[PDB]
Amino acid sequence: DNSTYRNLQHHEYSTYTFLDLNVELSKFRMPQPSSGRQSPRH
Amino acid sequence: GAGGALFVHRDTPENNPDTPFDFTPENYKRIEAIVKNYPEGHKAAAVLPVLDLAQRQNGWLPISAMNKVAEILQVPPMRVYEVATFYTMYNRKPVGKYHIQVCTTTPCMLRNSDSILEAIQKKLGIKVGETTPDKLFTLIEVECLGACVNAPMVQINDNYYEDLTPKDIEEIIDELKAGKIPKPGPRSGRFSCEPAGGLTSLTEPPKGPGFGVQAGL
Amino acid sequence: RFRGEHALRRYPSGEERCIACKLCEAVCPAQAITIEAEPRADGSRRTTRYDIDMTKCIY
Amino acid sequence: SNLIEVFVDGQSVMVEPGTTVLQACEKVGMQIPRFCYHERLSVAGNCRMCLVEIEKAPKVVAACAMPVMKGWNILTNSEKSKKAREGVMEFLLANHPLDCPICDQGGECDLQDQSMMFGSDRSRFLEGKRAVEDKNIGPLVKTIMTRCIQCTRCIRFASEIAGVDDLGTTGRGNDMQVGTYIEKMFMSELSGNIIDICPVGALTSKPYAFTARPWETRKTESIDVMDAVG
Amino acid sequence: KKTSFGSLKDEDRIFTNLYGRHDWRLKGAQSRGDWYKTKEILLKGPDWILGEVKTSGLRGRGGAGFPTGLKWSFMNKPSDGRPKYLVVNADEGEPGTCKDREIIRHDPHKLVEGCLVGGRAMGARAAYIYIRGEFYNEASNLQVAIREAYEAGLIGKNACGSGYDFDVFVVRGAGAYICGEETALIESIEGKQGKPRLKPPFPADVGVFGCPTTVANVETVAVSPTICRRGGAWFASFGRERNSGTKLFNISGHVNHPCTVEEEMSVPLKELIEKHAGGVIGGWDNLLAVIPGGSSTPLIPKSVCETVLMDFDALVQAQTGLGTAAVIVMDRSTDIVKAIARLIEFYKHESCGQCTPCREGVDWMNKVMARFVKGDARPAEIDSLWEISKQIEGHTICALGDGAAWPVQGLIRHFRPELEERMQQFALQHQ
Amino acid sequence: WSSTADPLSNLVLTFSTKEDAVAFAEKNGWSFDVEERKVPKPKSKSYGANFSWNKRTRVSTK
Numbered sequence A: 001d002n003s004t005y006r007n008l009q010h011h012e013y014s015t016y017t018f019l020d021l022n023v024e025l026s027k028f029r030m031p032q033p034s035s036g037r038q039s040p041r042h
Numbered sequence B: 001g002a003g004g005a006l007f008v009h010r011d012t013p014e015n016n017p018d019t020p021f022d023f024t025p026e027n028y029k030r031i032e033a034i035v036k037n038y039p040e041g042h043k044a045a046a047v048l049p050v051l052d053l054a055q056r057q058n059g060w061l062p063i064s065a066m067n068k069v070a071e072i073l074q075v076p077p078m079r080v081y082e083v084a085t086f087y088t089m090y091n092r093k094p095v096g097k098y099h100i101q102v103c104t105t106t107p108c109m110l111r112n113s114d115s116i117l118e119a120i121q122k123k124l125g126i127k128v129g130e131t132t133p134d135k136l137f138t139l140i141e142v143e144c145l146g147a148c149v150n151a152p153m154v155q156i157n158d159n160y161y162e163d164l165t166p167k168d169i170e171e172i173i174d175e176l177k178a179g180k181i182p183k184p185g186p187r188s189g190r191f192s193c194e195p196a197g198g199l200t201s202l203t204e205p206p207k208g209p210g211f212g213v214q215a216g217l
Numbered sequence C: 001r002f003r004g005e006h007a008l009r010r011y012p013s014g015e016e017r018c019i020a021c022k023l024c025e026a027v028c029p030a031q032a033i034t035i036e037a038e039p040r041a042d043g044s045r046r047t048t049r050y051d052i053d054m055t056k057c058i059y
Numbered sequence D: 001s002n003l004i005e006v007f008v009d010g011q012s013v014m015v016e017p018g019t020t021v022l023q024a025c026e027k028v029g030m031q032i033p034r035f036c037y038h039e040r041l042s043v044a045g046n047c048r049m050c051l052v053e054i055e056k057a058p059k060v061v062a063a064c065a066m067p068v069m070k071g072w073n074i075l076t077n078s079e080k081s082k083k084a085r086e087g088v089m090e091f092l093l094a095n096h097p098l099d100c101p102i103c104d105q106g107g108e109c110d111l112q113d114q115s116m117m118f119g120s121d122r123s124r125f126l127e128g129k130r131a132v133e134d135k136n137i138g139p140l141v142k143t144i145m146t147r148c149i150q151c152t153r154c155i156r157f158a159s160e161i162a163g164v165d166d167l168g169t170t171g172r173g174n175d176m177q178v179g180t181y182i183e184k185m186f187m188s189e190l191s192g193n194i195i196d197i198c199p200v201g202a203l204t205s206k207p208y209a210f211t212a213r214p215w216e217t218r219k220t221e222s223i224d225v226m227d228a229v230g
Numbered sequence E: 001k002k003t004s005f006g007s008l009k010d011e012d013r014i015f016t017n018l019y020g021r022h023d024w025r026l027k028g029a030q031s032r033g034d035w036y037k038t039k040e041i042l043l044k045g046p047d048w049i050l051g052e053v054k055t056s057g058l059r060g061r062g063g064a065g066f067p068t069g070l071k072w073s074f075m076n077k078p079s080d081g082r083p084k085y086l087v088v089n090a091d092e093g094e095p096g097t098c099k100d101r102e103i104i105r106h107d108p109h110k111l112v113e114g115c116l117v118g119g120r121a122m123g124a125r126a127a128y129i130y131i132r133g134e135f136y137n138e139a140s141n142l143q144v145a146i147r148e149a150y151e152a153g154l155i156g157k158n159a160c161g162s163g164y165d166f167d168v169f170v171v172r173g174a175g176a177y178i179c180g181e182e183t184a185l186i187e188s189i190e191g192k193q194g195k196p197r198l199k200p201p202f203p204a205d206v207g208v209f210g211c212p213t214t215v216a217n218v219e220t221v222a223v224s225p226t227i228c229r230r231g232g233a234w235f236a237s238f239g240r241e242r243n244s245g246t247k248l249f250n251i252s253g254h255v256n257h258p259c260t261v262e263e264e265m266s267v268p269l270k271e272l273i274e275k276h277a278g279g280v281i282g283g284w285d286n287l288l289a290v291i292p293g294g295s296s297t298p299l300i301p302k303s304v305c306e307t308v309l310m311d312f313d314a315l316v317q318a319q320t321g322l323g324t325a326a327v328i329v330m331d332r333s334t335d336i337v338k339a340i341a342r343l344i345e346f347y348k349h350e351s352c353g354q355c356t357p358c359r360e361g362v363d364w365m366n367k368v369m370a371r372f373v374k375g376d377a378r379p380a381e382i383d384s385l386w387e388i389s390k391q392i393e394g395h396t397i398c399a400l401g402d403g404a405a406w407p408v409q410g411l412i413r414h415f416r417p418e419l420e421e422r423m424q425q426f427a428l429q430h431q
Numbered sequence F: 001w002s003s004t005a006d007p008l009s010n011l012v013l014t015f016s017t018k019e020d021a022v023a024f025a026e027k028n029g030w031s032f033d034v035e036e037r038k039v040p041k042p043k044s045k046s047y048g049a050n051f052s053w054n055k056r057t058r059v060s061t062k
């Protein structure tokens, strides 16, 4: 119960884990808002 | 004390605008995702992630990588230069395969942080900021890493190692030398920062859902 | 402390100490000093003209 | 109308909404000390030389960026504002180089004049000063970087007026430097104006170097004929 | 009514998985009570959540200790035309503070649910979590927890049987303590240098991307879901008045068992150290000084920490301030001036350089303290240094100048004889 | 050196108002050109306009 440590999986995280998870997550996001132009410098 | 790193760039055969750099198609997909998170008006926000991704593809940031990031995000190159020279996790100079950062701030320094630094120096035979000749290890002294409870600690390539003794850091170093990857986390088997022999809190099993909910909800 | 004839000095290396700041010209109560300056061939800040009228000087 | 009443040294003035404390002081006839604020540039607030005391408020406000509120009584000659000015001037002069005799901006220095009128008359800095390497941005603007006080007027003018994003700040804290980070000439038809807006001798005129002192010059108002703008 | 604080029951804590022994994952979180009646909380309204937070007496856990209900109500103005955002601050910059890290690595789902609840309360369209650049494994755990919540429909499209759309994005910093400050946080999110902006405008008016934004600490965000479920009154009772709730305390330095533990608010400092830290090394008689709220707070000697509580008001009356509830202890076998000089040196390397007071004065302070460590200075300089600190403090854009000046003030105030003795010894040994 | 021949090369007079100067010039018999005083017009300054949501004013750096 209490004795075992359950956070080990992070022992097998690669260099691209964060960005791969973000890529998977991108399909679940609502459409982003728009300010009207492409950039403030436009 | 003093910084020791220059904030002006001079063209070098291994660091110049004609140095070859580009993004892998998977990295391009990652860049598209990163840009997508922000609103369609301010794509300038992606500069810190994408630059980091460039480093994760190269290990350091040449001027060509900064220029490529500026070209992709359509921001002036000078802004990318400011971002690269501002944040300290960006390597504008080549770095070793294993980047060792040893925190020496007061909470870690109190629990005898200098012994670990000197042990690493003696093991590698290099000074505080130098790099080993075979381009394998790099030693850096940094500010607090948010692991004060686990001090003394050092961080290597996204991995935290806490509660180090001199001996422990020697085993970490030569295990990195051997080829395998050491397991991150604190030493002495204290399992992420509870009291070593106390266990004074969170003993009884945790309560079930809706245990303390108020009436009318 | 005696004030006599004017002189321009130089450093032990042999380069003149004057940097054409024109403070002596500004403070001169009799307007006895005239100074013109330009960057030297090595980029040093040196005078091209430093005249003092001994007959307008009040010493 | 929509004018609100504010008091500068106990004197009532009617101002538009959004008017800054600095402009409220201007309307009555006082000029607040400044190094980074410019009318034609965007507000920065970096220098902290405009810090003034608002009565019945424990903390001094930046007059160049803080909009005035109705019923506020500014205290421009209060002891707190004078102490703040002296402290900021001390911090500004702590690392500044003893270059006044060789600096082309001797009698035209805002740093010098504001030290004379708002700072102290002596230093208590017992350390060694810093030195940064100079930059080359072409044949028109001579750059002596150690003199620079990090006001950022040049960056704002280049980005907003000249439309050129070549200038920026690199590094962090004390070692932060204003420049281009690469050998690159900032050349534009409006490039010379950064000499005027720079309060110090960090940016000077290269063809004009070492030739004259400001108190000697006779000023003649005239018209340009190099184009039809006049 | 209660007079003694510091005996908090095991079942009565909020972070029941602080030590990461239970399965943090979504299954484990549900087992521990997480994501329970979220729809009921969403459907009950934002005004109800704001009122519960107000009556809860909750104050910012980041350091300032500002009433969080007041800020979240500052967001409660009607729509303007711009999207509204909730930015969670996970920078975790302050030395000696590890609380944010533990409650992100071993308990992400409470953070995610608190993000959703706070976004509903403030009408935010999405949540941006600025995780520290060094916390990579913590960021990956938070990302996989967010993915699990998206899979279960807990956030995102309609987020519940509610009709409220909410996104949670995670952005990573790059080695910058100044980025913890809320306006510098916003600037770093927008791709510029982590330089703070001036106030006004406040983030509720012009924040991230120019949109109204509310910035909250990770600890502050986590408590809201639990607070709503158990009610404002339950949270309010703990601690003293205007200091209600439970706090995470990180005890480190010269203690036998340095640890992070959640406990009641107005616990005595000595009682907390003895109960959870295992006592100070060498016995309580060996203690020399304590920094209660991280480096940005003045130290206090033994005579003050003997009978001092742990909350905003009592620690302010001790001329320290609670800060980030980060206890760093120092016994009588350590060089205290060296520790304070190391803190000032850290502040010298962590200033953004935007304004002249912080930049120049903090570099000057670092040099002066480096001279003080060896005793190379003179006694008349000590007061000078004090004056320097006064000049820097309250004249800067942000509070990093305060966090650099306050340690110097505390060290001078409580150990001037030590500095004079070191100076005299240097004069003797050098003649 | 720089030689001159007019006695009035260094003569500059100061007046409180334009009318006083005009009166002095008229009573002393000098033909004059008067130039109206230039005043910097009031300007609308806003710090928050730097951090604009959709407008061009937003600054790339600060």
Ligand SMILES: NC(=O)C1=CN([C@@H]2O[C@H](COP(=O)(O)OP(=O)(O)OC[C@H]3O[C@@H](n4cnc5c(N)ncnc54)[C@H](O)[C@@H]3O)[C@@H](O)[C@H]2O)C=CC1
Pocket (backbone or CB within 6 Å): E060, E061, E062, E063, E064, E066, E071, E074, E091, E092, E093, E094, E097, E180, E182, E202, E203, E215, E293, E296, E323, E324, E398, E399, E403
């Ligand atoms: N948790 C950590 O890692 C660190 C914490 N800190 C702590 O941060 C504290 C100082 O932070 P600050 O934000 O500068 O203090 P602050 O009191 O000025 O502001 C803190 C919060 O209160 C809000 N606020 C304050 N006055 C307001 C007003 N008139 N209207 C609307 N909102 C208002 C602000 O929007 C902000 O969110 C320090 O005490 C320090 O201990 C410092 C470094 C690191």
Ligand SMILES: Cc1cc2nc3c(=O)[nH]c(=O)nc-3n(C[C@H](O)[C@H](O)[C@H](O)COP(=O)(O)O)c2cc1C
Pocket (backbone or CB within 6 Å): E059, E060, E061, E062, E063, E064, E065, E066, E068, E089, E090, E091, E092, E093, E094, E177, E178, E179, E180, E181, E182, E215, E216, E217, E218, E220, E398, E399, E400
């Ligand atoms: C230099 C500096 C660094 C800071 N770093 C942090 C940080 O890492 N985390 C944090 O929550 N607050 C930090 N703060 C204070 C923030 O203002 C705070 O996070 C924000 O106001 C939210 O506070 P709340 O969670 O109490 O509402 C910092 C403040 C300063 C001046």
Ligand code: SF4
Pocket (backbone or CB within 6 Å): C017, C018, C019, C020, C021, C022, C023, C024, C025, C035
């Ligand atoms: S110009 Fe006059 S005051 Fe200046 S350096 Fe030369 S001699 Fe000295």
Ligand code: SF4
Pocket (backbone or CB within 6 Å): D096, D097, D098, D099, D100, D101, D103, D104, D105, D106, D107, D109, D110, D111, D112, D147, D199, D200, D201, D202
């Ligand atoms: S810029 Fe001004 S203060 Fe600095 S050296 Fe030149 S004249 Fe002196």
Ligand code: SF4
Pocket (backbone or CB within 6 Å): D147, D148, D149, D150, D151, D152, D153, D154, D155, D178, D197, D198, D199, D200, D202, D203
């Ligand atoms: S060069 Fe001049 S204008 Fe530019 S930042 Fe420095 S002092 Fe300001």
Ligand code: SF4
Pocket (backbone or CB within 6 Å): E178, E195, E196, E350, E351, E352, E353, E354, E355, E356, E358, E359, E396, E397, E398, E399, E400, E401
């Ligand atoms: S006080 Fe320091 S960190 Fe804060 S804005 Fe000024 S220079 Fe930057």
Ligand code: FES
Pocket (backbone or CB within 6 Å): B103, B104, B105, B106, B107, B108, B143, B144, B145, B146, B147, B148, B151, B153, E095, E096, E097
């Ligand atoms: S002081 Fe070393 S990790 Fe915090």
Ligand code: FES
Pocket (backbone or CB within 6 Å): D033, D034, D035, D036, D037, D044, D045, D046, D047, D048, D049, D050, D051, D062, D063, D064, D065
């Ligand atoms: S003039 Fe206001 S801060 Fe510089």
Ligand SMILES: [Mg+2]
Pocket (backbone or CB within 6 Å): D105, D195, D196, D197, D198, D199, D200, D201, D202, D203, D204
């Ligand atoms: Mg100039």
